Design a protein around this ligand. Structure first.
Ligand SMILES: Cc1cc2nc3c(=O)[nH]c(=O)nc-3n(C[C@H](O)[C@H](O)[C@H](O)COP(=O)(O)OP(=O)(O)OC[C@H]3O[C@@H](n4cnc5c(N)ncnc54)[C@H](O)[C@@H]3O)c2cc1C
Ligand SMILES: NC(=O)c1ccc[n+]([C@@H]2O[C@H](COP(=O)([O-])OP(=O)(O)OC[C@H]3O[C@@H](n4cnc5c(N)ncnc54)[C@H](OP(=O)(O)O)[C@@H]3O)[C@@H](O)[C@H]2O)c1
Ligand code: NFU
Ligand code: SF4
Ligand code: SF4
Ligand code: SF4
Ligand code: SF4
Ligand code: SF4
Ligand code: SF4
Ligand code: SF4
Ligand code: SF4
Ligand code: SF4
Ligand code: SF4
Ligand code: SF4
Ligand code: FES
Ligand SMILES: [Mg+2]
Lengths: 352, 339, 292, 255, 339
């Protein structure tokens, strides 16, 4: 929703106000918190803890599920307050919001973020205790967005690489190639003829120096685990990003409260144009290219993080399977599934 | 609701058939300009197009002079005088008088039902008729112009007959016994009814809203109008004795010449008389004529909780029958500032 | 009736429900069961009296509540009976009730047949389809108070012979009823192979044993048969002031608040739970729309 | 224990996610046995006998039609969850044929899997009950699951979103700004979320069944406020793209 | 009746003092053109000159969505959900809404008093205010323009302040606790009140008598107007969910996810919806949209026996808030032949 709003506003030549952009960033941070907590605790925790379902983990790992629910509820409540709901937000309109909450609700949101910061710390410790399998060690090309401003963030105009080069967001199809494979409804992506990775670990590797606060302290402490060579560092990078984004959301709420009261929405008149917005999704770079002609969409191009990550997923599953070749089929299946889940795949966004 | 139609040539035959149900009371001409409800022997005497009667229809239930008890002073015993009330039909009741009968029913059948009133009220069949207002009628201001219930048959005037509303099982039986004389209502009769309603609404003298009349009367009890209109007043009480919704009666015990027997008598009373608010020792709670004159306005403009309308229905009998040419509606509109 | 503190609770809540237990379940037809109930409160059970023709609100917990007429006589104190047809959600849950289960009931509601002012006169009861149960209540009240009412006739009709309500009871009762000034007529309409009687009730009104001028008529069933039955009754000389019928509309409360059981027009606007369900002949005649 | 299976067709998994994020789902585990739900369970078997089957997503693959036929074979109650399963979702917004969309998106390339145009689940099997929304509300899931656990079934909704909009005191966007609000014809249960946030309804929960969805009156109201026929038809067919009533009712008022 | 004057500079102080009695609900602006009764934190938000509210004042006693019971399915038990209602003040109620509250009281404080309604009706203090007619207001036709009772304090607009009517002991206590802020009414204030009443009567759009509206509606149920206006109808039910005197509600039992607990819920309902008359087996007693559309007119134009008024008070909410631009008063005047 927010990447589409950014693309449409770029196409129609509209610039949102600073407080509206801050509130949109808070909503996006809520989405990242919910998605990362949900992934970490309900999709990659049970297979590390020896279960087959998080619903079977209610009596043994009670505190872990409790903190999982608290983080997920914080993200869901942020999205319920700012967007209309946790899924398919409707309050995010062209040029702002249909209705903004009262000031006391924002104060309560800031207080709840402050309360949830220790939960993020515990999550980072719990996922630092886990294991990065050495069967998948190899050089990775990490692509991530260059943040706008002077802080680790989600909105950006440039796309960085682990090879050092950087290109403008609108020129993405000059450097990224989409091709269709005969075994999937998704389009695999290549960078200079080679597969690449986008995600939380790529974000950390590319924009580590932009972190500030407890996130920077934790990153400096645990830089040894966050090497851009193992795909299994993505979960720990997600925990680190939760830690960062709680504080970032607190600061953005302070910035928004500095300019109260806020008019919910600006009048936008739809001129023709072509806008490409590369915001950083919880799972990697999201590219939205929309062309507007007479108040209508004439050209749409969506490239999603999982479509970016599928080729690297195939390569790393190949190396994992060759390392665990001719073993018991169940063990190979579960380890390959763990490798795939390390990439937090959203198959729905792959096909869009 | 049943909407049977009575043709113009069967009206007198239906009125003759009404005499099979009891005694028929219909408005007849008692003088050149005055009407009254009198017992019918010749059906041609009934005046269907009349303005008002010299006496309200309450005289058939709240009798003008009634003997309540007969007594023996030795071994004190009061024996009630109740006669077997045979069924009777009151024909030609206007809608305002029907609402007045409803108001008097609320007064006389509320908690202690009046036996004398009830035995005659239960035996009366109220057949209402439509009317064209004259200069004295303001039943549209008091909202007593169209009757909802309280009748058995209601006759609505048509160019080629009548439209009959049946609202009671008694009216159903009356229609079904003489169904030969009745016909079916067509769209033409409905259009004629609509035209008559429009003409009736156009024929009223005053078209005003009187919501705040009670509060303005309360606020303006020290008006010079009260003095100037009471100086005209004759204290004759016609405005109360010819008012459909006046409940007041005076009681008296009359001893026969033997000194042992006698009777207790009930007659209509007026608040315009001296002894209406007179207590022992000489204290009158309405001592001056102005006080009684204003008290009538206050009482008639009061709000009836059970029905939702004022005790004044708007018949204009107090204005038409006032020998001193005092206008009730004119004084009320002067209080409201509409003059 | 006007039972105090048990029809509205000591909490003054008219929606408050009483705990009752189902003792006997009996399948009359395929989509029909007769339920025998008693209140789990012994004092409430001994104090609860109703009028023939009144209904109750049967609350199955968690599904909803439905209005059901009482089919047993009010003089069978301690117990009351309900006859329920499976029409949908709540009745589907009701039909699974086995004996010994607890369900919630509030009532009685509405006005019943004026059986107190029917003293010393004949009774004609015309029941069609599911309308037998309120007329079963009236019939059993008359049978318990036989000295009060004169000759009584019970006409029960149904679409098929297997759908006749209380066929076994009325067939067993016919003996000593014919000798006890009671006539039971049971007929079918859409079954031309039925061994018993065939036809509509208006055909069997002439076969009644009731004096037409001194007979109280109670008709229950679909609203479409009412006009034909009225024509037949009026032709044979039954007085229109003594004809009573029952109507059904959607009910959610039974106390007059939900506004779903509305009949009539702007001239006479009435509610079934407060002004019925028993209506007189002149009410049906005056305002159209009460039938169909 | 009631055996419940949640199956995924072509979907965004919003309905499964909405059910998974409910805190009351922890109460469902002691009362119901979850057979097939791959999002949370890994030991889930696709071909198993389930008492109640919840189906999410549209039928956009031949393998999906085989799966829904299998589910209808294996389930006593089949429940269609969400706008994708009930009315085809937003994927059925376009009336353009499959080959045109395929050429526009994937070019001239082969995938070896067979797709089809988005259709509701009710076209290929018999759905006994429906759960409306995109995603369905938590209250809808609670009511449906609770009534199924008691042995009853949920009541279908035939009242518009305007009911909940007027219960909550939301300002009417259609009376003030003339916005194209689809609320008067859309099923309630969402507690008037979009009109409460100042947005117009886009009819995610779907149009009222039982032939009491008046697109002609709403089209006349839209026409008084200056909208062309095709704009009204597209707006109403955003989520009701498989509704045959919309075209006929709008063309009646524009003829 | 007790008359007090509130000067223009003490109005906000008196409204601040009203918060000492409880929570204050007054009409505020929720959008550019719409009002509603909302809880007051800043007294300056109160709009004294408003036309109507997006929700009727019945939402404080007949709540829009209310939880009646909570139940355990095992051990069948329904426990009523009633909270301790603290006293509150509803300020700014127009006279039409006061009459609507009286009508709803007759509906919900009948032989079976509604506990949920009665508990909140006991603790509510109704302070009424004067208003100027809009183009949609026809409270003069329904006779709900001037309120007699049903309030505690009534505020009447004056050029130099307010005129306060005290009708109940609660209003007497409210006036006597803050008697420092009130003054004495002179003849000038009475004259200003009379002028405001004259202007208010002149500001109404329609001046007609609607006595035969019910009977004409009964006689004209086969009119082409019903089809014409029903084809415009959206079946959105706003005319019922915004009507002050609509009694209808729909009940539903919701079972929690444990299968043992749950609750019973009550929400406002409309007769314009399909399931208002559905009687199982597929039979609907109002099966067409025309039937429900006409049923609303029949129900609203019916006669209330206990009060003597129609169930429609004349606020115009059904005409102002109809998204299909359907005129209730216009269609009623079409039935009467006044157009
Ligand atoms: C005065 C009266 C007496 C009745 N007596 C009997 C009787 O003796 N035996 C019998 O089998 N049935 C009787 N009924 C009908 C009975 O109420 C319905 O069969 C039942 O309410 C519908 O249940 P359902 O599961 O089909 O509800 P659904 O069709 O699923 O509908 C749900 C709701 O609709 C309402 N409803 C549906 N039909 C009716 C109806 N006909 N009357 C009132 N509300 C209705 C109820 O409130 C019910 O909770 C009577 C109805 C009334 C009004
Ligand atoms: N429970 C009560 O005490 C009570 C009271 C009042 C109302 N009700 C309601 O009344 C209904 C009972 O009837 P039902 O639905 O069971 O009926 P039904 O059997 O489905 O059909 C009506 C029956 O009556 C016959 N019938 C006789 N004369 C008729 C006539 N003139 N017009 C039409 N049919 C005529 C029909 O013959 P055909 O098949 O040829 O038409 C058929 O046998 C239920 O809805 C019930 O709830 C019940
Ligand atoms: N994170 C993330 Fe998505 Ni469901 C992918 N791929 C789109 O933003
Ligand atoms: S009729 Fe006229 S003169 Fe006689 S008492 Fe009445 S007001 Fe006075
Ligand atoms: S006080 Fe006077 S006006 Fe009132 S009822 Fe008695 S006589 Fe009539
Ligand atoms: S006060 Fe006058 S107009 Fe009013 S009812 Fe009495 S006599 Fe008639
Ligand atoms: S007051 Fe009205 S009803 Fe009475 S006679 Fe005059 S016009 Fe007729
Ligand atoms: S109905 Fe909506 S939430 Fe559910 S799967 Fe389809 S698009 Fe997602
Ligand atoms: S805003 Fe939309 S949903 Fe709400 S009342 Fe208006 S039309 Fe209905
Ligand atoms: S208002 Fe309309 S679009 Fe918004 S949640 Fe409700 S049904 Fe869906
Ligand atoms: S508000 Fe208007 S469109 Fe909506 S239901 Fe009422 S009459 Fe119909
Ligand atoms: S029937 Fe219709 S108009 Fe009458 S109270 Fe119920 S919802 Fe309102
Ligand atoms: S019908 Fe219309 S004018 Fe009358 S009370 Fe209801 S909303 Fe107000
Ligand atoms: S209907 Fe009458 S009382 Fe109500 S707001 Fe309009 S003018 Fe005021
Ligand atoms: S059942 Fe609710 S009004 Fe009669
Ligand atoms: Mg793409």
């Amino acid at each position: 929703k927010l990447t589409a709003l950014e693309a449409a506003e770029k196409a129609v030549g509209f610039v949102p106000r600073e407080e509206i952009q801050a509130l949109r960033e808070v909503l996006y941070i809520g989405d990242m918190i919910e998605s990362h907590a949900l992934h970490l605790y309900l999709l990659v925790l049970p297979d590390y803890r020896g279960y087959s379902s998080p619903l079977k983990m209610v009596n043994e790992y009670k505190r872990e599920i409790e903190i999982a629910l608290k983080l997920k509820n914080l993200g869901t409540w942020m999205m319920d307050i700012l967007g209309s709901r946790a899924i398919h937000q409707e309050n995010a309109v062209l040029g702002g919001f249909g209705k903004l909450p009262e000031k006391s609700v924002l104060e309560k949101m800031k207080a709840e973020l402050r309360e949830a910061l220790p939960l993020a710390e515990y999550t980072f410790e719990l996922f630092a205790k886990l294991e990065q399998y050495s069967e998948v060690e190899g050089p990775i090309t990490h692509l991530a967005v260059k943040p706008r401003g002077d802080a680790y963030g989600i909105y950006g105009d440039y796309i960085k690489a682990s090879d050092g080069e950087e290109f403008p967001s609108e020129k993405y199809r000059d450097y990224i190639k989409e091709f269709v494979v005969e075994h999937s409804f998704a389009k695999h992506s290549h960078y200079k003829g080679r597969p690449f990775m986008v995600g939380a670990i790529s974000r950390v590797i590319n924009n580590a120096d932009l972190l500030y606060g407890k996130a920077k302290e934790l990153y400096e402490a645990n830089k040894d685990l966050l090497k851009g060579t193992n795909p299994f560092a993505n979960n720990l990078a997600q925990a680190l990003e939760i830690v960062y984004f709680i504080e970032r959301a607190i600061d953005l709420l302070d910035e928004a409260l500095a300019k109260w009261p806020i008019k919910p929405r600006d009048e936008v008149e739809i001129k023709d144009g072509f806008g490409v917005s590369t915001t950083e999704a919880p799972r990697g770079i999201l590219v939205y290219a929309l062309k507007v002609e007479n108040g209508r969409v004439s050209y749409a191009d969506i490239i999603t993080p999982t479509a970016f990550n599928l080729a690297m997923m195939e390569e790393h599953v190949r190396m994992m399977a060759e390392k665990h070749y001719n073993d018991d089929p169940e063990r190979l299946k579960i380890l390959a599934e763990m490798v795939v889940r390390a990439y937090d795949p959203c198959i729905s966004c792959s096909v869009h | 609701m049943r909407y049977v139609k009575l043709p113009k040539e069967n009206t007198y035959e239906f009125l003759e058939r009404l005499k099979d149900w009891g005694k028929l009371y219909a408005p007849v001409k008692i003088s050149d300009k005055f009407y009254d409800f009198r017992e019918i022997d010749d059906v041609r005497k009934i005046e269907f197009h009349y303005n008002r009667t010299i006496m309200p229809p309450k005289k058939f239930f709240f009798k003008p002079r009634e003997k309540l008890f007969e007594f023996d002073i030795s071994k004190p015993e009061y024996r009630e005088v109740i006669e077997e009330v045979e069924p009777f039909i009151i024909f030609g009741v206007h809608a305002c008088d029907i609402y007045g009968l409803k108001i008097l029913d609320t007064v006389y059948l509320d908690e202690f039902p009046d036996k004398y009133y009830k035995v005659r009220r239960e035996k009366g069949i109220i057949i209402g008729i439509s009317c064209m207002p004259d200069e004295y009628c303001f039943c549209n201001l008091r909202e007593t112009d169209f009757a909802d219930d309280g009748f058995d048959l209601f006759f609505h005037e048509l160019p080629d007959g009548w439209l009959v509303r049946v609202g009671t099982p008694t009216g159903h039986r009356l229609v079904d016994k003489n169904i030969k004389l009745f016909e079916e209502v067509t769209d033409k009769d409905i259009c004629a009814f609509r035209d008559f309603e429009k003409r009736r609404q156009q024929a009223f003298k005053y078209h005003e809203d009187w919501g705040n009349l009670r509060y303005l009367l309360e606020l303006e009890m020290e008006h010079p109008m009260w003095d100037e209109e009471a100086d005209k007043c004759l204290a004759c009480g016609i405005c109360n004795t010819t008012c459909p919704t006046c409940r007041c009666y005076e009681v008296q015990d009359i001893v026969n010449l033997d000194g042992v027997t006698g009777y207790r008598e009930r007659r209509w009373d007026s608040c315009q008389f001296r002894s209406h608010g007179l207590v022992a020792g000489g204290h009158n709670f309405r001592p001056t004529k102005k006080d009684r004159f204003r008290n009538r306005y206050l009482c008639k403009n009061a709000y009836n909780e059970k029905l939702g309308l004022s005790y004044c229905v708007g018949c204009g009998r107090c204005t038409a029958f006032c020998p001193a040419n005092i206008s009730f509606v004119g004084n009320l509109r002067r209080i409201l500032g509409l003059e | 009736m006007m039972l105090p503190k048990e029809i509205m609770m000591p909490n003054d809540n008219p929606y408050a429900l009483h705990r009752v237990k189902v003792l006997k379940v009996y399948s009359l037809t395929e989509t029909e069961k007769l339920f025998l109930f008693r209140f789990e409160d012994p004092e409430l059970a001994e104090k609860w009296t109703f009028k023939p023709g009144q209904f109750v609100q049967l609350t199955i917990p968690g599904v909803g509540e439905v209005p059901i007429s009482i089919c047993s006589s009010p003089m069978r104190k301690g117990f009351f009976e309900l006859c329920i047809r499976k029409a949908g959600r709540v009745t589907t849950v009701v039909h699974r009730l086995k004996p010994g289960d607890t369900v919630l009931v509030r009532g009685p509601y509405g006005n019943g047949f004026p059986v107190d002012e029917w003293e010393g006169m004949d009774l004609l009861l015309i029941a069609a389809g599911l309308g037998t149960a309120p007329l079963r209540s009236v019939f059993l009240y008359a049978m318990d108070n036989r000295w009060k009412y004169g000759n009584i006739t019970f006409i029960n009709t149904a679409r098929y012979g297997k759908d006749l309500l209380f066929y076994k009871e009325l067939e067993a009762m016919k003996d000593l009823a014919e000798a006890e000034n009671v006539k039971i007529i049971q007929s079918v309409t859409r079954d031309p192979n039925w061994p018993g009687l065939k036809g509509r009730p208006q055909q069997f009104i002439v076969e009644a044993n009731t004096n037409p001028k001194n007979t109280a008529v109670a008709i229950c069933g679909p609203p479409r048969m009412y006009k034909s039955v009225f024509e037949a009754l009026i032709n044979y000389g039954y007085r229109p002031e003594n004809i009573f019928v029952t109507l059904e509309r959607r009910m959610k409360c039974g106390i007059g608040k939900c506004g779903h059981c509305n009949v009539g027009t702007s001239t006479s606007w009435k509610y079934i739970c407060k002004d019925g369900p028993v209506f007189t002949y002149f009410d049906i005649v005056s305002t159209p729309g009460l039938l169909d | 224990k009631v055996r419940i299976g949640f199956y995924a067709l072509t979907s965004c998994y919003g309905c499964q996610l909405q059910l998974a994020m409910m805190d009351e789902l922890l109460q469902l585990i002691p009362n119901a046995e979850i057979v097939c739900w791959f999002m949370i369970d890994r030991d889930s078997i696709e071909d198993e006998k389930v008492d109640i089957a919840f189906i999410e997503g549209s039928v956009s693959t031949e393998e999906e039609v085989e799966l829904v036929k299998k589910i209808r074979e294996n389930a006593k109650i089949v429940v269609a969850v969400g706008a994708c399963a009930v009315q085809g979702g937003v994927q059925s917004w376009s009336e353009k044929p499959l080959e045109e969309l395929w050429k526009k998106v994937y070019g001239d390339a082969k995938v070896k899997f067979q797709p089809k145009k988005a259709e509701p689940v009710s076209k290929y099997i018999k759905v006994d009950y429906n759960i409306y929304g995109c995603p369905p509300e938590k209250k809808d899931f609670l009511y449906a699951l609770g009534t199924f656990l008691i042995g009853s079934w949920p009541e279908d909704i035939d009242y518009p979103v305007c009911l909940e909009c007027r219960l909550n005191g939301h300002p009417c966007i259609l009376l003030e700004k003339g916005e194209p609000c689809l609320g008067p014809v859309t099923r309630a249960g969402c507690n008037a979320r979009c009109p409460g946030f100042g947005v117009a309804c886009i009819g995610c929960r779907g149009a009222i069944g039982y032939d009491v969805a008046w697109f002609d009156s709403l089209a006349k109201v839209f026409k008084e406020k200056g909208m062309t026929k095709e704009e009204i038809i597209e707006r109403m067919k955003m989520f009701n793209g498989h509704d045959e009533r919309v075209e006929k009712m709008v063309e009646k008022i524009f003829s």
